[PDB]
């Protein structure tokens, strides 16, 4: 909600509380998942063509006891935007790959999980320098593109250390570069994204699968978004980039997500989705295995802009086998039930 | 403070800073206790009869160094309210027992401590589904009641695991059910509450006192709140529910709290209170012991709605003996001195 | 930004996002330093002469992954202010020494580091009771002074325990007292501050250098702040007060900071600074050593009140030798590059 608009600056303080419960035969996925999100979005007019901006968003778990409660920053970035020239921002932000994979990340609770946070340039991550150009310098309506650099986020100790080092190898990265292009016309959308990040020494030298010099991704995507209908599909091919449970990464992974949704005038929005991550030549005697495979059925009822409720049903199609047990991957179904206040 | 009210939604961002110091011969109770509280309370009109709402409240300690600062979510819930029918909300919230025990929880700093947070359905806790009906379907002014279910919050590992598991056994619970009834007329209040929670395996199998299948509470309460006078008393009988320091819980505990307060026109509000928790047949050679016993004398001076100062004097009547030392219970007096800004 | 002003209370919710990157040959100083700051400042009119107030400020790192994100309270205090009589506030706040040392703490990113947080009464710390008088009871325009007491913040365990105890010996303190006087006339400023804190048992008995009964500081300072020119210098002499890396404190330290800045009408503000901390008779075979010594060159460009960008270049003049390696002191240069949105 816009709580300030005055003398060239405006500020939106926004947030939600999601009363959320998971039901599953997998006990680690069963029970209270209530949480809160909170952020600010600030925009200042410097000149008629130049705006300055910043955004910060935080998540705070509401399902924990008071002696041990966890929270985290999702995004935190500052930038400048010049008219018909583009924008630049730096901070914690979304990897440019997400400019396309985001098109299928629209389910009530599940979805968006053929990749992770702090997973190279695929989703949220630290130290993104992002240039964006919208409508191609004002010349081609609907043609957007982005160039992005992500600086090394290394270990907390020793060789490969950065000031913001983290010991979880799955959250590290070397220097990376990526780009995205998207074209939208009359509700139809086509898009493509590529990224290439150097892998750190720790990532290649702690005995995990899916090692090599570089983590790489190539994504194609399509969407239709008009007349109350939302259709979208993304295909992504990754190398040393896609996490395979606790085992490491996939030497090669083939990822696919498709979604269909409809919005009835009275407020109900049914949803049907399919997601799949296919691991190829994984190593360690595993060969080809599904990392992820599920169908998703759900519905959100929107009372108005500030209040909604939903059910999301993940029909988990993975078989319980050696690989999924070793990897620690959930092969059970989950139902999510939520009641959501936002401002 | 209401910082947004527009197009069917309103938002109260509220908070306080309590400059607070404790004085005690017990060194673990002596010194700086400064802290901050912050929250939001949001209400949306869906139709003329249906409102949606959410609330989040957070505490942030202000008495710690910057290298190691602790905070936590007190409440975080979403709900719906239909006129003359009732409300439902789910999240982290107050156990229905507190609908009555809260009547004596009005001291400047102390009080409210014959029970804990994350202590079955007695106070704040995770995963409360709460139905409430006010004025009995609009038929009986002042007659309110509540039915509440609390879902299992189990261990972080192994048998009895939940997705939000916690290893501190004192913060776990099984499935629980409770109810409350309250009648208020012309400043007089009568009320009752019952709860019954299943105990977890961990809680019954780590060698603590006060084990059994279920944690149970029965509470009766009375209050007078008018003509600048506040009188209140609550009696609660608990089984396997009341924490006894580090030792476990009380097989049976008899808890009593009484409070008298007066508000002078010029701003001073003196306070006198008595609290007692009597443990019965505790086990481990202890038999009957006082878990808590103190008299409380204090005064709050209210400069206005946003600024106040207070002294609270806990006259601790527990004797230093084997039980209190073993349990780690404070038997010393504490004086609290506070200066409080709120919005 | 002022987001509430109503019926005698006002509230400023303020904050910034600093997209920040460090470049250094020292890997522990190299990489993403993005962070967010957020606070509130609240003022209530009680009477025409008496205001109540509170302030809370929090920092949240934005350079960390989502599994492990760190934050902390910088200030958190409540107070009262009576006209021509002075103010009193209690909480976590700034030590009165900072009333003068702050005059050189104006660099874009570096500076302000001949002392620390939670470092006796030199900067931010817990449990400050501060009295302040501005314009000497309304009689001498520009004459301000402060008397401050800081209560013991002791260990988490055993002898010397406080309720807010901390095991990091560098963050502990005994009871302390301090004062400050400042005179400002027509852009010229002269000032002095003294503090004296008792040292804790832990601080004197864990085998560190720079032990003794008391940590003491004496500070003199000068500034010129007009006609777009900012000049400032502070000299501080400390005993058992100034931290020497991991080794302990300096038996005596001589600290000096000087700063020159200019603000061009079009927005650029160049900055040149010099900082030095000279350790005397340190013990452990070290004798006299520089604890800190660097020249600082930088520039901030202010797009407007809400948006700015800067480069800060710390030319580190310390030599890599036995002392700096043993102490763990950075002897390398750092360049900081920042883009800053604030409200
Ligand atoms: C192997 C081909 C290399 C391609 C050249 C590009 C270099 C790779 O990306 C560098 C990542 O580091 C960028 C760090 O960002 C610092 C920006 O700070 C912005 C603050 O406003
Ligand atoms: C705020 C104006 C300065 C930033 C513009 C830089 C990016 C524009 S364009 O080059 C995007 C493609 O890289
Ligand atoms: C309905 C009557 C209100 C309850 C009466 C008890 C008041 C407490 C007095 C004891 C003071 C410590
Ligand atoms: C509410 C008016 C005074 C009530 C005092 C009753 C005695 C309570 C103690 C019994 C616990 C076993
Ligand atoms: C050790 C003796 C202390 C006094 C006993 C407590 C009585 C307090 C009464 C409250 C007035
Ligand atoms: C000798 C100095 C010790 C300081 C004691 C601090 C007490 C201040 C408490 C006031 C709280 C509002
Ligand atoms: C050095 C900053 C400009 C980099 C060019 C952006 C397009 C790749
Ligand atoms: C926008 C530039 C990205 C380059 C990707 C490199 C593929 C090996
Ligand atoms: C040692 C005496 C405590 C200080 C009281 C402060 C209240 C103004
Ligand atoms: C190796 C750090 C030196 C960079 C200084 C650049 C000055 C703008
Ligand atoms: C045990 C299942 C309870 C579900 C109630 C709300 C769906
Ligand atoms: C910009 C001034 C540099 C002084 C360097 C001293 C070695
Ligand atoms: C519960 C009765 C306690 C008495 C001990 C002296
Ligand atoms: C400025 C020096 C003070 C003297 C006390 C040791």
Author numbering:
A (entry chain D), B (entry chain E), C (entry chain F): 1 to 343
Sentences from the paper on this structure:
Porins, which are beta-barrel proteins that traverse the bacterial outer membrane, facilitate the uptake of small polar nutrients and are the main entry pathway for many antibiotics. The crystal structures of OmpF and OmpC show that they are both built of 16 amphipathic β-strands arranged into a barrel with a central pore. L3 folds into the channel and narrows the pore at about the half way point, forming a “constriction zone” or “eyelet” that governs the effective pore size.
The subsequent isolates retain this sequence but have also acquired further changes: at D18E (OmpC26), D18E S271F (OmpC28) and D18E, S271F, R124H (OmpC33). In OmpC26 (D18E), the longer side chain of glutamic acid protrudes into the lumen making a new salt bond to K16. A water molecule bound to the carboxyl group of 18E makes a new hydrogen bond network with E109 and Y310. The presence of this mutation slightly narrows the radius of the pore on the periplasmic side (below but not at the constriction zone) (3.28 Å to 2.95 Å). This creates in OmpC26 an elongated constriction zone along the axis normal to the membrane. In the other subunit the D18E K16 contact is stabilized (69% vs 41%), as seen in the OmpC26 and OmpC28 crystal structures. Interestingly the change in sensitivity to cefotaxime (OmpC20 to OmpC26) correlates with the introduction of this antibiotic into the regime prior to the isolation of strain 4 (the isolate in which OmpC26 was first detected). Direct measurement of cell survival shows that a porin-deficient strain of E. coli transformed with OmpC26, OmpC28 or OmpC33 is, in each case, less sensitive to cefotaxime than the same strain transformed with OmpC20.
